[PDB]
Amino acid sequence: HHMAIRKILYLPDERLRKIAKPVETFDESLQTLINDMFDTMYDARGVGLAAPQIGVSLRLSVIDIVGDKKEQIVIVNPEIVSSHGEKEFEEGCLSVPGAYDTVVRAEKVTVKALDRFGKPFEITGEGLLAECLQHEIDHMNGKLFVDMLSPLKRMMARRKLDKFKRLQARKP
Amino acid sequence: HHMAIRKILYLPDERLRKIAKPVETFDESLQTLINDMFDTMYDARGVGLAAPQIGVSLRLSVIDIVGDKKEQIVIVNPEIVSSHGEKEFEEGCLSVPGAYDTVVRAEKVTVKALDRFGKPFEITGEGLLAECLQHEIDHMNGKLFVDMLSPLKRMMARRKLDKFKRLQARKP
Ligand SMILES: CCCCC[C@H](CC(=O)NO)C(=O)N[C@H](C(=O)N1CCC[C@H]1CO)C(C)C
Ligand SMILES: CCCCC[C@H](CC(=O)NO)C(=O)N[C@H](C(=O)N1CCC[C@H]1CO)C(C)C
Ligand SMILES: [Zn+2]
Ligand SMILES: [Zn+2]
């Protein structure tokens, strides 16, 4: 069922910039991957995680905004079918540790996808769920939230990330 | 100048519930502690850290909302002298890993404190800075952000924290 908590990749790892490939096989190894992704997400204090963030080039993300099992969402091969409004969100990313910035995203989005067993579903989110859905799909297209920021803010995020990496190297 | 990245304590460690004592001596040992607190905060991807969170019962917090050295704030023996408004904030805490919730705090706060060398100063913050000043001072009074949540939300944060601890035990 579960195998290992996985290493999360940080910028500038090129695997975070690859366009992920659709999932086309629903077998036990996919279920093990999904289970490890949830474990990895919770262990990293996130509310979502996309497969490219652990070096797996698949259009697959796990999400839990509430933080318990009954509200777990898996989006496989998602597509945004509609979106409405614009809203500022204060956001971070497990692949850009330490960087927090305000970004503008749709206030409401509807996503069609396959669930973790390959069965079609749709979900409409607002607030954090809408933000998370857009953030995770961006990862599947090699896009990270710092990309939409000004050059100044991208530079500051780079400096913060570089300092984080230097501190991790001094951690016991 | 720097000694070691420190272990951050999680609920229910009783040291997070103690009332911190005022700082009385501004010596080199205090500077080393402050430097280590900044390192620990950045390494944990936080924008503030209070000394009780590393098991040091002192009314001392480090803050960096922006993420660079020019905006570092140190508050020593702080006192909120005024505040205005009430605003919802989405918040987490380094001492409650994995828990994110909306809390109500003042929108604007004015704090009198000593800086890292013991010089009195006053700071007025809005937005994130106001939220952070209030969050950090709460830590000095043995208060964590989950305390203001409903019993249902406190239970959900406890179980999320317990799951995080179980995953940490299974991390390589
Ligand atoms: C919020 C929805 C979009 C962000 C999703 C990310 C996780 C991620 O990188 N997926 O790619 C996350 O959990 N980020 C966290 C985050 O930004 N959070 C956590 C919940 C609320 C919000 C706080 O700004 C940080 C703290 C790691
Ligand atoms: C936000 C001001 C009050 C929170 C301060 C805490 C740090 C802390 O626990 N100090 O005691 C923090 O950085 N929390 C982070 C947090 O809530 N952040 C980071 C910046 C913005 C906001 C996102 O919700 C989480 C992600 C660890
Ligand atoms: Zn991300
Ligand atoms: Zn805290």
Residues B55, B14: Cα–Cα separation, whole Å: 9
The residue count for chain B: 172
Burial (0-12, 13-18, 19+ Cβ within 10 Å), A146: buried
> H or E element: which one contains B88?
strand B87-91
**Contact between chains at B100 and A67 (C-beta distance less than 8 A):** yes
Burial (0-12, 13-18, 19+ Cβ within 10 Å), A124: middle
In our burial notation (b when 16+ CB lie closer than 10 A, e otherwise), range B65-92 reads: bebeeeebbbbbbbeeeebeeeeebebb
β-bridge partners, B118: none
Torsion, Cα of B40, B41, B44, B46 (10° steps): 180
**In the structure, how many helices (H) and strands (E) does chain A have?**
3, 7
**Domain covering A1-172 in this structure, CATH number:** 3.90.45.10
Q: Are strands A108-114 and A73-84 parallel, antiparallel or unpaired?
A: antiparallel
Radius of gyration of chain A, Cα coordinates, nearest whole angstrom:
16
Using the mean position of ligand 1's atoms as its centre, give its distance from the Cα of residue B18 in Å: 30
Using the mean position of ligand 4's atoms as its centre, give its distance from the Cα of residue B65 in Å: 14
Q: Which residues of A touch B168 (CB under 8 A)?
A: 43
Side-chain-facing half-sphere of A129: CA atoms under 13 Å: 18
**Contact between chains at A68 and B128 (C-beta distance less than 8 A):** no
CB B58 within 8 A of CB B50: no
Residues whose CB is less than 8 angstroms from the CB of residue B151 and which lie 6 or more positions away in sequence, other chains included: none
SS (HEC) of A4-46: CCCCCCCCCCHHHHCCCECCCCCCHHHHHHHHHHHHHHHHCCC
Structure-solving method: X-ray
> H or E element: which one contains A132?
helix A127-140
Residues B36, B165: Cα–Cα separation, whole Å: 24
Whether ligand 1 lies within 6 angstroms of the CB of A37 is answered as no
The domains of chain A are located at 1-172
Residue B83 region by backbone torsions, left for phi larger than 0, else alpha for psi between -120 and 50, else beta: beta
Nearest to B132 by CA among A62, A90, A52: A90
CB B19 within 8 A of CB B143: no
Residues B166, B172: Cα–Cα separation, whole Å: 12
Measured N-to-C along each axis, helices B151-170 and A28-43 cross at an angle, to the nearest 10 degrees, of: 110
